Amino acid sequence: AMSSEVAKLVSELKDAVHSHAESQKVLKKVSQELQTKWTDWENNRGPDYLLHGYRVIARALQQTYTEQSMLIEGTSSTGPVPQAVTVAKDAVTQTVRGAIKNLENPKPDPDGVLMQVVISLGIEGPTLDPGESIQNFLETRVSDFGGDDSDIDYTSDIARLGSALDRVRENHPNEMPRIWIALARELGAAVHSHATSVRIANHTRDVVRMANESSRLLQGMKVLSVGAWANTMTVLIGDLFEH
Amino acid sequence: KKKRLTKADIGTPSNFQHIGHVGWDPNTGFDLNNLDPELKNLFDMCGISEAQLKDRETSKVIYDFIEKTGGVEAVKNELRRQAENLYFQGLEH
Numbered sequence: 001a002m003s004s005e006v007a008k009l010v011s012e013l014k015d016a017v018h019s020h021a022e023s024q025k026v027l028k029k030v031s032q033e034l035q036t037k038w039t040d041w042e043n044n045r046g047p048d049y050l051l052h053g054y055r056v057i058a059r060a061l062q063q064t065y066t067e068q069s070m071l072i073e074g075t076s077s078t079g080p081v082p083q084a085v086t087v088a089k090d091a092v093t094q095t096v097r098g099a100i101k102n103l104e105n106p107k108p109d110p111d112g113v114l115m116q117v118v119i120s121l122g123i124e125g126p127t128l129d130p131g132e133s134i135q136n137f138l139e140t141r142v143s144d145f146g147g148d149d150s151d152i153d154y155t156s157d158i159a160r161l162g163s164a165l166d167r168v169r170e171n172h173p174n175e176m177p178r179i180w181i182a183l184a185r186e187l188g189a190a191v192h193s194h195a196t197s198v199r200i201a202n203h204t205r206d207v208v209r210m211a212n213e214s215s216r217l218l219q220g221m222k223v224l225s226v227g228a229w230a231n232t233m234t235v236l237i238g239d240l241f242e243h
Numbered sequence: 244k245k246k247r248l249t250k251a252d253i254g255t256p257s258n259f260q261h262i263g264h265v266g267w268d269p270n271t272g273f274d275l276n277n278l279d280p281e282l283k284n285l286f287d288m289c290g291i292s293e294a295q296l297k298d299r300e301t302s303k304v305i306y307d308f309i310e311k312t313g314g315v316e317a318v319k320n321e322l323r324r325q326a327e328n329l330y331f332q333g334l335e336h
Contacts, residue, residue, distance in 0.1 A: 019299070020270060031254025039250050070316050129260035130277070137259065149244035223264050227257035235253055238246040 027224050034217045034232060041210060042239065047203065052210035053240050054195040058188065059215055060123045060233065065184040068126055068177040084167045088179045091164035095157050096186045102152060103194075103241060111152050112241030115190075117141045119237050121161070122187040124230040126180045134169060135162030145238055194241065265306065265315055272302035281319045282309070 001007035041049040099114035120141050121134070128137065138158045147154060168175055214236075222229040248255075266278045273296040286296065286305070295301045309315060 016270075023270060027254055035250055035253045038253070042250075070319055124259075127261050127263075129262060132260055140258075144247045146244040146246060221254065224269060225254075225256070226261040226263050227259065228254050230259070230261060231248060231255055231257045232253045235246075235248050235250060238248060 023224060027221065027228060030217055030220050030224070031228070031232070034214065034221070037210075037213070037217075038236075045204075045207070045210075047198075048208055048210070050198065050240065051195065051203065052208040052214065053236050054191055054198075055208060055211040056214045056218070056236060057119060057123065057233075057240065058191050058195065059211065060218075061119075061184045061188040061191065064123060064126045065181055065188070068180040068184070071177040072181070073174055082172050082175065084164075084172050085175045085178060088164040088168045089182050091160045092179060092182045092186060095161045096183070096190060098157055100190055109151075110243060111150060112243075113142060113145045113147050113150055113152070114154060114157060115194075115241040116145045116237050117154075117158075118161070118183070119187060119191070119240075120234050122180075122183050123233055123237075125165075125183070126177075127226050127230060130169065130173065130176075133162070134165040135159070138162050141234070144234065265309065267302060267306050269303070270299060272297040272299055273305075279315060279319075281322050282315055284322060285318055 001010040038049070041052070095114075096118055099118050102114045103110055103112045117138060121138065125134065125137065128134075135158070138161055142148070142154050142158065165176075165179060168179055218229055218232065221232065262277050263274055266282070267273050275293060275296065278296075291305065296305070309318065312318070
């Protein structure tokens with residue numbers, strides 16, 4: 001770095017490489033904390049883990065609600081509600097009532113892969129690059145949650161949602177937050193109902209202050225790496241809604 | 244069947260593309276394509292350069308002030324009040 005002009009090249013790249021691998025060290029420590037805790041809490045505290053997992057999700061649905069609330073254009077209906085958004089809002093209610101149904105009123109056997117996926121959509125979807133395909137996201141997630149082996153066919157539900165949500169995402173981008181809030185309020189009710197019915201089967205109530213811990217560590221991850229957070233979110237989701 | 248992402252995969256990078264909190268990344272600064280419009284508008288009224296937004300040391304100090312004064316929400320509400328004030332003040336009696 002003798003010259004004035006190579007020393008800057010050296011310095012800038014020096015810095016770029018170091019503070020990258022520095023921020024990786026951080027993330028790794030936060031990850032390892034979150035890992036040992038959840039591993040223990042699963043293997044020890046049994047259904048209190050589960051109970052807190054719902055609340056960590058439940059908290060994350062409310063967060064995307066209020067976050068996406070502040071992107072909506074006008075709460076006023078300024079012209080006709082476009083076709084693509086009516087169709088999107090309806091698909092939200094249908095896919096969610098049906099993820100509710102695969103789980104609560106099945107046909108011989110309860111399955112929760114559909115719940116899991118739309119939950120990941122609800123928390124992680126609003127954080128995706130606008131360029132990301134909602135259809136593709138949903139397809140990738142039925143594999144990541146099992147799905148291919150499972151004897152329910154989801155291809156109907158996925159194409160309902162992916163088609164509707166992607167049409168808005170490309171054709172009416174400023175209306176997407178309207179759909180995300182809808183998705184979150186239905187999911188938020190759906191989850192809180194699953195949480196209260198799983199409470200009925202003998203439990204330590206206020207030690208699910210785990211929730212404030214995980215949502216502390218997860219909030220730290222999020223500002224370091226939104227992507228890493230979305231991955232560890234979908235890990236939590238994968239331990240939920242099963243049996 | 245097995246879920247591809249288990250507890251040992253916690254913190255591993257997502258194979259998907261993500262916007263980033265308040266449209267800010269702690270190594271690359273503010274993603275300028277996915278910056279919020281009303282936040283951009285604030286930054287232009289402050290003369291803040293695109294190169295200052297994309298610089299790590301300075302974007303942190305912007306990010307942190309924005310969090311200090313009540314998150315992006317307060318900023319949005321403020322530019323919005325200012326616009327409906329500018330609406331009524333364009334009216335000539």
